[PDB]
Symmetry: C3
Subunit: 113 residues, 3 copies
Amino acid sequence: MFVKETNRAKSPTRQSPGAAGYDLYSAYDYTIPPGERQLIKTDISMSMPKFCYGRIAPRSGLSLKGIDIGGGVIDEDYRGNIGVILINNGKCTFNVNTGDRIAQLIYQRIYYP
Amino acid sequence: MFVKETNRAKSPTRQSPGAAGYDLYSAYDYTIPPGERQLIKTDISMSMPKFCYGRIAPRSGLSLKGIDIGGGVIDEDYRGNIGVILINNGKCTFNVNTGDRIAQLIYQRIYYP
Amino acid sequence: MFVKETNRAKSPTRQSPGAAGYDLYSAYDYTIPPGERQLIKTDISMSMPKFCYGRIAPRSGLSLKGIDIGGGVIDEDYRGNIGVILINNGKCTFNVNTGDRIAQLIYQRIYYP
Ligand SMILES: [Cl-]
Ligand SMILES: [Cl-]
């Protein structure tokens, strides 16, 4: 499912039994200015479960501080690094440190109507 | 499923049998400035259905007015008041009155691959 | 599933075999100034598959350029044209040409608790 590309990568974890998906962590330091966005690297290479797709989903605590998720639809049987688009829609600079929890990866089945 | 914590709370409703989820209503009054966000309280405590999570989803009419949803991933078998992060990305202030329909809560089952 | 209302409409495509949903295309020319949003017409009418709802989901390519999705919850047995709210949170004017891929429509079955 998940492979570490570097020793900076942290394995995606589940916060709770009833967690919708997997916690994602930044592998690098970032500084996002207000009204700007940054693609954050996890350094986790992922293999999409067959007949499923992924959605990068917001942390509530970050959303309360103005930080939103851009994009995050992971499909087409994607194999590669997990990137997270953090959008700073707050008034102040937002700092990301290596190892910070940044988002959740939620799996759902592809529906074929 | 839904417990009104105060007399200001309104029971979440499915308006049509084809609705994805349950209409949520503000339990309080708010005035959201342009470029700002606010956690809107519903005063509704929810019991999560087993192996499910909830997503706060936008009203289309509000999205056309520049109002978006922040956060809104309700998981971890969450027990407590439903809050909706309303983001005003319009040019003018957005008024939220008690009783206003603010969002929809959509349930999905958790997929643990 | 999909019906063209005009000669300008382009039929939604499932890209890869592991695509989450169907690519949507603009039927018209649009100019979106920074900090503004626009409802983009596809001129494609849809009939909702039984016990399902739709979600307009972002293209990663546009999200990385600062283009986000507003609204996009298609429920309540929806019959009619598909429109996509594109939000220009970039710093320059965003151009939408006829035939441009603008988003994806992702179907999910409604969970009834
Ligand atoms: Cl943490
Ligand atoms: Cl979403």
